[PDB]
Design a protein around this ligand. Structure first.
Ligand SMILES: [Mg+2]
Ligand SMILES: [Mg+2]
Length: 1146
């Protein structure tokens, strides 16, 4: 699957790349020509000045070639970066729901960011650098062939071994990188899944277990990365060992020739200079081939997904969209099973039918397949066998886009995007008028509370619409469905958390327009289906009961059964590596040795020339040449050892540091309080992208790149030391030419710091958008807002794209100018040395040696410029990582200080509780209500929807500390009590709970952390929650893997599972927030009886909008305007004719 990375190369992109290749070739060819100059050098002041002028002229050519090469490659890389991101997100959004179910999804988020950053940020400039180095090696060989025939032939004959070794090591490195990126993606998926359910996790105190689960994937990634580092370092060390062995053999053959005299001393010296330059070119090349191998590895999975052509294309136009669409639908022999569990049969081939305006309600036992019916109708899943048809024409023939456009579906367990309410509604249809929105919301009985809040329609909802109460979220979803003005409404339990009055008004409003809308109302509050045209009774996947309400009651079947039952770190990050300092010590020592031995070739050449011209004894000359060759071979072996040691130690140090940074940042994010998760900046997608970006950037600036930079800086330092020692009044020239380099580097860093900060913020926003789309993928697919999300993602990426092009130009300027200035300095130093020699102030051999050292350093310095952008980005990435890790909220879950009472009676008292959500601090919700619950008393509260019911329990859970007031526990102020202790004792049933993607047994066991859960306990809890029977019923029993966020199991099933989870703790305090949100009255009665049997001894607070689950409540509290308007038992409240009587009667 090679070359796929260029699949999105535009003709302008191709021109960019080829021009860059030519420019890199030209730039590389220039350096060895300097060595060719020595060949001419090997009146003299005239030739010295001639060579100096030639070098000065070549300086501008090198300037232009470098700028062109770098800019073209970076521009192509940016274009590929943007095109690949766009097309990959397109492919992800194209996938049908089946592929979305079978495969893990949380991976895709971090896959995007990590893979793109590791693929294109690896191809772009590094490929150009590799072409430059290969061109330099080839040009060195060519000049050697010009000046010789034997030694150059030997070098060429030894080259293909190095070539084949590079190829094989690149292949293996890419293979390893595939698994490394898979491990990173698994870690990212775990992080995303945990963060989405942050409320539940902090409720059940599961931070440690999630942290360990993340650490597992982190450790796998660490191991794979260390393996890759070893592979790369071994490859490069072997290449250089072969290079030095070839050089030593060439030196021996030159000793053989000198006696023969076939080539002069100057000729062989020039050949050796060219070959040494070629070896250093290969040394510079190796990192680029490593990076390209990483790029291919990262491309593997991305293009695997891209080439995943689905069956239900959500973009093709191969269907019919007839103008006249009468809302008539019918199922026919619809055999269907979910691809998530192929075995289970859920639809036995039922057959329904409705006519335009006829409302066919679906009623039955929980999880009987109603949601499956609407899913199959929406063409999310193609039935195994069946002729599901609308207005005669089969659904399959019709075009999917138009079909879903004309269908409006309420999101059972509603899901709203992290935008403003206006836009949340606007997602219903593209072109929508504010008047239409007002009319729809009025129809939804939502205008009143919307106007109540400041920024009536400008108020923001959080992730998955968690900033609003369940009833408010349902009403907003109702508005979203209505605004589409659909011919086929798919109302799905839209009367779930609403207050009885709210449900009544919504039903009346829906009926007002039901005449022309083909609604399919699914509900369990049977009142909401009393006036339904047709009521469908589901059993075992088939419909038996039918007809209107009177006929259904006469049948005395399932429907009648239920009805009756109702009755800043440039040194801080380096500081953090205190536990690795042996690795840095060994690596820096080896890098210093390599740098010093780099220019040492000049001294070696000087000594060899002296030996060849010192004595007249051919035997002595042969002995000296043999000694020098042996020294070169030993130098090569030692260089192999040192290269591998330094490269490996720095690679392992980078990997370990990055893993520790990832673990620390994730743990810090878990530490942070829920309130911090409220801020729109901190959303799950943002956080996961933040991880995958910051950690990777810090790695990139602390990994083997730092190793190569230390090697190059040591090379430059030892070159300057050699120049100063052997020459004086010359190295001062280069030293005084450094200051422009210093200033240019400062300017480049200053610009790129801001550029990268802006790019990072934009990338965090884009990750937020992508994660919001993918996590709520079902809803967006149902609304066909995929195109809108793609546009949002492209618009968000727009800023990084322009910033990337700008960085391409900036870095091209910096690198090309630095190289050109270095070559001008070399030419000027040569001219000055010639002038001094004519002045009889320096021997020519010394000047030649110093020029050799300076040219070696000029070849070396090619890497610092390449490093500069990496350091620029990593500075800010680190800064943010340190900021996050150092953060500490008002309340710390890990904090073990405070009060930890041995035993709690379980009496909860609240007084003067005044609170407002920090998201909208101005708006008050609690009016200082006073409450008191004794041990073994199932207190309950009811009132108008979204009147702070969930807020009371959330304050009880210390999600937010009260703004003003005092809430105690057994006569002890909650604050004084250790947060973890209470969070363990208390139990929260949540609202529309999100179960994790694990084994159902594992999900239930999650309820009581810090102590293993015996299978007996889990099955007992399931039986108590009236699900153990079903749980055993399904294949694999408890091995079944609930989909991401519990999306696979039906609403009632996950409700019961959450009930069981909260039950496993057997808590002294049991807080239930609409535990019976979606349950058949029979199951509701069973669970209520189970709770009542255990009611005594376990103080309980239950909130629900169904009087049936609260009729026998110990004490019912009526909440109005945040205050306890009416409080009393069922008999007392019924005797009075206040709000409770009105709500019950309706
Ligand atoms: Mg359902
Ligand atoms: Mg609630």
């Amino acid at each position: 699957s090679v070359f796929s990375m260029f699949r999105y190369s535009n003709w302008l992109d191709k021109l960019y790349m080829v021009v860059g290749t030519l420019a890199a070739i030209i730039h590389g060819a220039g350096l060895p020509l300097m060595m060719l100059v020595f060949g001419e050098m090997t009146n003299l002041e005239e030739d010295m000045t001639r060579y100096a002028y030639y070098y000065s002229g070549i300086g501008a050519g090198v300037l232009v070639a470098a700028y062109i090469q770098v800019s073209f490659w970076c521009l192509a890389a940016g274009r590929q970066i943007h095109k690949i991101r766009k097309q990959f997100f397109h492919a992800i959004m194209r996938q049908e729901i089946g592929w979305f179910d079978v495969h893990d999804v949380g991976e895709l988020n971090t896959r995007l960011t990590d893979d793109v950053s590791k693929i294109n940020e690896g191809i772009g400039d590094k490929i150009g650098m590799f072409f430059q180095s290969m061109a330099t090696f080839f040009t060195g060989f060519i000049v050697g062939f010009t000046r010789g025939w034997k030694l150059t032939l030997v070098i060429l004959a030894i080259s293909p071994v190095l070539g084949l070794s590079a190829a094989v090591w690149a292949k293996i490195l890419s293979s390893f990188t595939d698994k490394e990126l898979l491990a990173y993606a698994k870690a990212g998926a775990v992080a995303e899944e945990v963060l989405a359910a942050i409320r539940t996790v902090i409720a059940f105190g599961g931070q440690k277990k999630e942290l360990e689960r993340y650490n597992k994937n982190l450790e796998e990634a660490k191991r794979i990365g260390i393996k890759k580092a070893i592979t790369a370092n071994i490859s490069i060390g072997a290449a250089f060992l072969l290079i030095y062995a070839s050089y030593a053999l060439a030196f021996w053959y030159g000793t053989t020739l000198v006696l023969s005299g076939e080539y002069s001393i100057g000729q062989v010296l020039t050949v050796f200079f060219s070959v040494l330059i070629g070896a250093f070119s290969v040394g510079q090349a190796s990192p680029s081939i490593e990076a390209f191998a990483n790029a291919r590895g990262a491309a593997y999975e991305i293009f695997k997904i891209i080439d995943n052509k689905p069956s239900i294309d959500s973009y093709s136009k191969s269907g019919h969209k007839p103008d006249n669409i009468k809302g008539n639908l019918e199922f026919r022999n619809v055999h269907f099973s979910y691809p998530s569990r192929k075995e289970v049969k859920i639809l036995k081939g039922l057959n329904l039918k409705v006519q335009s305006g006829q409302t066919v309600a679906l009623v039955g036992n929980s999880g009987c397949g109603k949601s499956t019916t609407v899913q199959l109708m929406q063409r999310l899943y193609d039935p195994t066998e069946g002729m599901v048809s609308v207005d005669g024409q089969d659904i399959r023939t019709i075009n999917v886009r138009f079909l879903r456009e004309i269908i409006g579906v309420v999101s059972q367990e509603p899901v709203l995007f992290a935008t403003t309410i206006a836009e949340n509604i606007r997602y219903g249809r593209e072109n929508v008028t504010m008047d239409e929105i007002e009319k729809a919301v009025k129809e939804a009985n939502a205008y009143d509370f919307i106007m109540k809040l400041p920024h009536k329609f400008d108020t923001l909802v959080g992730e998955r619409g968690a900033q609003l109460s369940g009833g408010q979220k349902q009403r907003i979803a109702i508005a979203r469905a209505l605004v589409r003005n659909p011919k086929i409404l798919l109302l799905d339990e839209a009367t779930s958390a609403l207050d009885t009055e709210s449900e009544a008004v919504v039903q009346v409003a829906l009926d007002k327009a039901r005449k022309g809308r083909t609604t399919i109302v699914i509900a369990h509050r049977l009142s909401t289906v009393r006036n339904a045209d047709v009521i469908a009774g589901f059993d075992d996947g088939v419909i038996v009961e039918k007809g209107n309400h009177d006929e259904l009651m006469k049948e005395k079947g399932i429907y009648f059964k239920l009805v009756t039952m109702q009755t800043v770190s440039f040194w801080r990050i380096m500081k953090l590596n205190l536990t690795e300092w042996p690795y840095f010590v060994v690596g820096v020592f080896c890098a210093i040795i390599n740098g010093g031995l780099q220019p040492a070739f000049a001294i070696i050449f000087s000594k060899i020339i002296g030996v060849f011209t010192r004595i007249d004894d051919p035997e002595t000359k042969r002995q000296n040449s043999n000694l020098f060759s042996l020294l070169f071979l030993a130098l090569g072996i030692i260089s192999f050892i040192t290269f591998f040691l330094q490269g490996f130690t720095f690679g392992k140090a980078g990997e370990i540091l990055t893993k520790r940074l990832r673990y620390m940042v994730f743990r810090s994010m878990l530490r942070q309080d829920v309130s911090w998760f409220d801020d729109p900046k901190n959303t799950t997608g943002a956080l996961t992208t933040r991880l995958a970006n910051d950690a990777a950037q810090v790695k990139g600036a602390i990994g083997s790149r730092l190793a190569v930079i230390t090697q190059n800086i040591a090379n430059l330092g030892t070159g300057i030391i050699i120049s100063f020692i052997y020459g004086w009044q010359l190295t001062l020239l280069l030293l005084a030419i450094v200051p422009i380099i210093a200033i240019a580097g400062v300017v480049e860093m200053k610009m790129l710091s801001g550029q990268a900060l802006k790019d990072k913020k934009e990338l965090e926003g884009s990750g937020k958008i992508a994660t919001e789309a993918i996590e709520n993928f079902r809803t967006v697919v149902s609304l066909t807002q995929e195109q809108k999300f793609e546009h949002m993602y492209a618009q968000s990426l727009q800023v990084p794209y322009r910033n990337s092009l700008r960085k391409a130009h900036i870095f091209g300027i910096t690198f090309s100018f630095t190289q050109a200035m270095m070559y001008f300095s070399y030419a000027g130093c040569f001219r000055f040395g010639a002038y001094l020699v004519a002045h009889k102030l320096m021997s020519f051999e010394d000047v030649l040696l110093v020029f050799s050292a300076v040219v070696f350093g000029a070849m070396a310095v090619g890497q610092v410029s390449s490093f500069a952008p990496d350091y620029a980005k990593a500075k800010i990435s680190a800064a943010h990582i340190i900021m996050i890790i150092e953060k500490t909220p008002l309340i710390d879950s890990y904090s073990t200080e405070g009060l930890m009472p041995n035993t709690l009676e379980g009496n909860v008292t609240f007084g003067e509780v005044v609170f407002n959500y920090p998201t909208r601090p101005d708006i008050p919700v609690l009016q200082g209500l006073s409450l008191e619950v004794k041990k073994g008393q199932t207190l309950a509260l009811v009132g108008s929807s979204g009147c702070g019911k969930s807020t009371v329990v959330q304050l009880l859970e210390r999600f937010y500390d009260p703004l003003a007031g005092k809430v105690l526990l057994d006569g002890k102020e909650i604050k004084r009590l250790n947060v973890q202790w209470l969070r363990a004792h208390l139990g929260i049933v949540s609202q529309e709970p999100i179960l994790f993607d694990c084994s159902i047994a594992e999900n239930i066991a999650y309820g009581d952390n810090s102590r293993v859960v015996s299978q007996e306990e889990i099955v007992r809890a399931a039986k108590e929650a009236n699900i153990h029977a079903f749980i055993e019923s399904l294949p694999n029993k408890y091995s079944t893997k609930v989909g991401d966020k519990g999306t696979q199991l039906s609403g009632g099933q996950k409700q019961r599972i959450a009930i069981a989870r909260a039950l496993v703790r057997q808590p002294h305090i049991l807080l239930l927030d609409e535990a019976t949100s979606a349950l058949d009255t029979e199951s509701e009665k069973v669970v209520q009886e189970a709770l009542d049997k255990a009611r005594e001894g376990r103080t309980c607070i239950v909130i629900a909008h169904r009087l049936s689950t609260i009729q026998n409540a110990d004490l019912i509290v009526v909440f109005q305007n945040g205050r306890v308007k009416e409080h009393g038992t069922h008999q007392q409240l019924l005797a009075q004719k206040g709000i409770y009587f009105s709500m019950v009667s309706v």
